[PDB]
Amino acid sequence: DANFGRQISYQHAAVHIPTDIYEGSTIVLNELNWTSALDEVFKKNREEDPSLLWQVFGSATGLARYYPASPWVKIDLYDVRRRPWYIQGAASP
């Protein structure tokens, strides 16, 4: 797709889980079930505005579910809870 420097997919949303966080635990799986309803709004948002970039939900669990789905970028040390946009919204200055 153009306006995207990589391969994407509007069919669903991708989930990023940090290496230190085990996928398939009770905390993650419960967080990974109710977040599946975010995909409907993800597609609805793009329908109104086709020129829309990444929409991401950074969970306090640790996993980030973003749309559209796209394969992730050595080892990966990415944690959504340390990103500047997550920290600025978690608390006031």
Partner: protein, 96 residues
């Protein structure tokens, strides 16, 4: 002949070592388990992958699997306790 006369001492030593093995079983039964990384304190969260820092340096990380491992010389049952106490009595690896 020297072996035959000794046996009274061997019997007492074996009995005392068996009693000490039973006491060690009562004490450290299954308590010697540990995870591959010193951050998970139970098998329920000692699963998946984790980031290991080689030689303690923060700038050299590497991905490793974490396994809920058990000590080689444990006190899980009576025979294991007897073997561990024998290795201790030989003064080898007893500080560990």
């Amino acid at each position: 002949v020297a072996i035959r006369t000794i046996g009274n001492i061997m019997i007492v030593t074996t009995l005392l070592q068996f009693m000490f093995a039973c006491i060690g079983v009562q004490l450290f039964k299954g308590k010697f388990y540990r995870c591959t990384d010193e951050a998970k304190s139970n098998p329920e969260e000692c699963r998946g992958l984790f980031i290991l820092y080689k030689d303690g340096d923060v700038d050299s990380p590497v991905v490793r699997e974490r396994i809920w491992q058990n000590s080689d010389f444990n006190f899980d049952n009576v025979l294991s306790a007897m073997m561990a106490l024998f290795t201790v009595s030989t003064f080898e690896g007893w500080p560990a």
